[PDB]
């Protein structure tokens, strides 16, 4: 019957497109989150080193790193369902735009917000990993539903 051929075509198209886009998006999201955490750690290190060792070149390097992190954060908003957490990360990053500390170490509130920034970035990478696993499991469940439909059609 024509129904079998039509459903085969739809299955091919849907499964192929979903498999390709899910693989690519998951890989991009994982790599982006890992680079996010790494540049956050580098951000903290550059901040501390500039505060201990006063030098405008360290400030320029920190500016470049902050711009890179802001760009990379702007390309990850559409994946995490809760926009509040992404906006909080953006606000913390923009709060870390200035380098100010009186003593050798950073400002006390600066230290607290840096620790909050690190914890939030760790939670961000965890949430991105969970969403990636969710997308993979969703592909698995959809293809399982297709298999169940095939089994129901097997009754004839």
């Amino acid at each position: 019957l024509l129904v079998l051929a039509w459903q085969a075509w739809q299955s091919l198209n849907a499964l192929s497109d979903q498999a390709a886009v899910t693989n690519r998006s998951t890989l991009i999201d994982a790599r982006r989150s890992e680079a996010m955490t790494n540049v956050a750690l580098e951000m903290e290190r550059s901040y501390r080193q500039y505060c201990v060792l006063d030098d405008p070149t360290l400030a320029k390097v920190y500016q470049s790193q902050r711009k890179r992190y802001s760009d990379m954060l702007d390309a990850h908003a559409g994946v995490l369902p809760d926009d509040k957490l992404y906006q909080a990360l953006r606000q913390d990053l923009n709060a870390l735009a200035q380098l100010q500390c009186k003593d050798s170490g950073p400002e006390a509130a600066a230290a607290a917000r840096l620790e909050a920034f690190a914890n939030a970035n760790t939670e961000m990478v965890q949430a991105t990993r969970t969403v990636v696993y969710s997308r993979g499991q969703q592909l698995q469940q959809e293809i399982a539903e297709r298999g169940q439909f095939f089994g129901w059609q097997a009754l004839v």
């Binding site: 290190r45 201990v52 060792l53 050798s104």
Partner: protein, 163 residues
Amino acid sequence: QLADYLPTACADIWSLRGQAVETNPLYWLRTIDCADRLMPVQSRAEARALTDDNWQNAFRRGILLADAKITPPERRAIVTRLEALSAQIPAQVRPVYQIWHDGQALQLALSAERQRYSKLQQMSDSELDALRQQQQALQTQLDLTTRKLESLTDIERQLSTRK
């Protein structure tokens, strides 16, 4: 044939003048041995009534004010002045004049030596103070740099152990 006046008091011998007595040195020794035992303020009081226009009066003024504790500007002035005294002097008093001149010479030499010693001491103290303060500044700079190094290493260790 020269008489002796040493046993009698030195006041009248110091008071008397004259060319007849001035040919003998023994009364000059009497005056010099009396001047030191005299009261320096009393010596100044008795020498104030003297003048400097003649060699004898300037000579005895030098004796009277030399033993007194005086600042060496006027001592230098009088030892530069007594060349006028040397310009007119009989041979009898030349030896004692020479001995007095040597005495004053080593006096002012000792004063100049002690002033040079004080100047060198103060110069050494000043340079020591300057070097000590420079050392303190450089030690503080080293403390600052070693604190910066220690803090930087500590932040590196903390970030390493965060992972």
